[PDB]
Amino acid sequence: NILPSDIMDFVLKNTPSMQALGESPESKEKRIKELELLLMST
Amino acid sequence: RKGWHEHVTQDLRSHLVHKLVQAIFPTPDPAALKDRRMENLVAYAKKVEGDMYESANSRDEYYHLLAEKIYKIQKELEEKRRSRL
Ligand SMILES: [Cl-]
Ligand SMILES: [Cl-]
Ligand SMILES: [Cl-]
Ligand SMILES: [Cl-]
Ligand SMILES: [Cl-]
Ligand SMILES: [Cl-]
Ligand SMILES: [Cl-]
Numbered sequence A: 001n002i003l004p005s006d007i008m009d010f011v012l013k014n015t016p017s018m019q020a021l022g023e024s025p026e027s028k029e030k031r032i033k034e035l036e037l038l039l040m041s042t
Numbered sequence B: 001r002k003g004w005h006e007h008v009t010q011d012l013r014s015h016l017v018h019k020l021v022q023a024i025f026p027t028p029d030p031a032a033l034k035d036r037r038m039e040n041l042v043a044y045a046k047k048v049e050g051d052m053y054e055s056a057n058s059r060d061e062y063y064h065l066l067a068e069k070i071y072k073i074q075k076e077l078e079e080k081r082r083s084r085l
Helices: A005-013 A028-040 B010-024 B030-034 B036-053 B059-082
Strands: none
Touching (some): A028 B059, B036 B059
């Protein structure tokens, strides 16, 4: 992977979980299950 | 149908409304956070959450209904933006 891990860590640390980070293909159903997961978290 | 409510705290519902707001509008700048329109957004979120809370039959279905709503709102935002390109 090409994003330096320190930058990756900086971005991920500072991004709300509910915000999308990119638009990689995945079915509607998989995204909804992911969203269910994001809501369940503490 | 409504027994699961006993386990759901107001503290939980509040965290969920918060996640619902972030899902609609992830990282507002200070000006946006201060805008009256941000209140409109928050009220809409609380409205959706309350709707799902009062129509789900289990905690699992409650999360699922919220997720479906989020999917649908985000899809609406993405489409509107693409339509202007
Ligand atoms: Cl978060
Ligand atoms: Cl769809
Ligand atoms: Cl995965
Ligand atoms: Cl019951
Ligand atoms: Cl105004
Ligand atoms: Cl209430
Ligand atoms: Cl328009």
